[PDB]
């Protein structure tokens, strides 16, 4: 049978995002619009600093920018937490940790709000080294393919997950930047406890030509793998 979490993604739907966020003071609010299509994994959104200039690069900021989304084959459906958790939701924490420089914490709840899918967003950064690759804009605008493993967290009613993201640097170096995160539900109700698999993504980064706004237009797709 198709489970109400399922339910409530095998069409197109509307995606929201809202972010406050404070690296080392700097404070800035981007706003997200877009949707998404899990039957082909594929998401589809612009993001808009509402505050001015984005004081970190746009790429540092793509993890944190619905994993719900994600394409699960059909043999894998039994392990796919997120959508289980819909339509009440789950909050999803992250640390990132930047090597050789400061980390973000963050902190989202995922949730429908009528047929739009939410994802409500507080990050805060700290100890960024004001002339590091990050405060300092030097990563480029582009983004690599990833692995990104999942395991059960029974004791918490969710999920661990973990991945290194790897952000090419003006130079040619890399600056990587090592995730850490659980998500937890909203409700009281049954999840999916998966075994351990991973979500494998890629990702493409644009601007749109006629938008004066300092801002991001994201292509992004994931598919579930790992157990056959």
């Given at each position: 049978m198709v489970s109400k979490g399922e339910e409530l993604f095998t069409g197109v739907v509307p995606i929201l995002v809202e972010l406050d966020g404070d690296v080392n003071g700097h404070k800035f609010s981007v706003s997200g619009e877009g949707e998404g299509d899990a039957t082909y994994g594929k998401l589809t959104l612009k993001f808009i600093c509402?505050?001015?200039?984005?004081?970190?690069?746009w790429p540092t900021l793509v993890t944190t920018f619905?994993?719900?989304?994600a394409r699960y084959p059909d043999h894998m459906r039994?392990?796919?937490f997120f959508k289980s958790a819909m339509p009440e939701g789950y909050v999803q924490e992250r640390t990132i940790f930047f090597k050789d420089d400061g980390n973000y914490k963050t902190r989202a709840e995922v949730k429908f709000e009528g047929d739009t899918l939410v994802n409500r967003i507080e990050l805060k950064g700290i100890d960024?080294?004001?002339?590091?690759?990050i405060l300092g804009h030097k990563l480029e605008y582009n983004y690599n393919s990833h692995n990104v493993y999942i395991m059960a967290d029974k004791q918490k009613n969710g999920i661990k997950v973990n991945f290194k993201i790897r952000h090419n640097i003006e130079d040619g170096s890399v600056q990587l930047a090592d995730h850490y995160q659980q998500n937890t539900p909203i409700g009281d109700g049954p999840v999916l406890l998966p075994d351990n698999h991973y979500l494998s993504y890629q990702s493409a980064l644009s601007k749109?030509?006629?938008?004066?706004?300092d801002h991001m237009v994201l292509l992004e797709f994931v598919t579930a793998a790992g157990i056959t």
């Open positions: 509402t505050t001015g200039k984005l004081p970190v690069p619905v994993q719900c989304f039994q392990h796919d960024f080294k004001e002339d590091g690759n749109d030509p006629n938008e004066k706004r």
